[PDB]
């Protein structure tokens, strides 16, 4: 592992960040002082959920809660393939992270994000309560249930 960390090959270190993510070694990746890994995540954060989650962990441990709430909220409003329940977790985290002070950011900007995440989380829970009840309902034909699961187990719908 010395030979690994003693390298200056950049495509290599990118390939190793991806490999650590694959194997699940949050142990060793979260323990890198470097910003090089943060910058690498900032480009692909809004591309994949698993990468965004890593980026948000780096922000939170650095008391940058508002920036994580921003990543999580945009990810919940996006058209990436994300389940409704995963979008409930993202909003719930963003709601908490925007409710606490982050230095350098105005109280107004925090509250406006904590409010957008609170409303979207309220709608998401309604949608989850619906989807669950509809799937379990004995009086609903199977043919329709599959159709319900397609349109409700994804991005959050209007009221």
């Amino acid at each position: 592992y010395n030979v690994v960390n003693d390298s200056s090959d950049e495509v290599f270190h990118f390939d190793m960040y991806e490999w650590y993510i694959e194997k699940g070694w949050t142990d060793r990746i979260l323990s890198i002082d470097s910003p090089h890994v943060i910058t690498y995540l900032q480009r692909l954060a809004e591309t994949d959920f698993r990468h965004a989650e890593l980026l948000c962990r780096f922000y939170t441990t650095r008391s940058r809660f508002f920036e994580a709430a921003q990543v999580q909220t945009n990810l919940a409003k996006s058209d990436l393939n994300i389940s409704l329940k995963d979008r409930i977790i993202l909003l719930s985290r963003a709601k908490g992270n925007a409710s606490v002070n982050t230095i350098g950011i105005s109280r107004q900007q925090q509250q406006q994000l904590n409010h957008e995440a609170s409303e979207l989380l309220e709608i998401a829970h309604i949608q989850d309560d619906l989807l669950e009840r509809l799937v379990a309902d004995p009086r609903i034909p199977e043919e329709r249930k599959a159709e319900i699961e397609e349109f409700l187990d994804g991005p959050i719908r209007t009221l």
Partner: peptide, 17 residues
């Protein structure tokens, strides 16, 4: 923003196509 429209929906109790 909510807008009720009972007019044209999709029969929740009938399959598609």
């Amino acid at each position: 923003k909510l807008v009720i429209n009972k007019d044209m929906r999709t029969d929740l109790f009938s399959p598609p196509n």
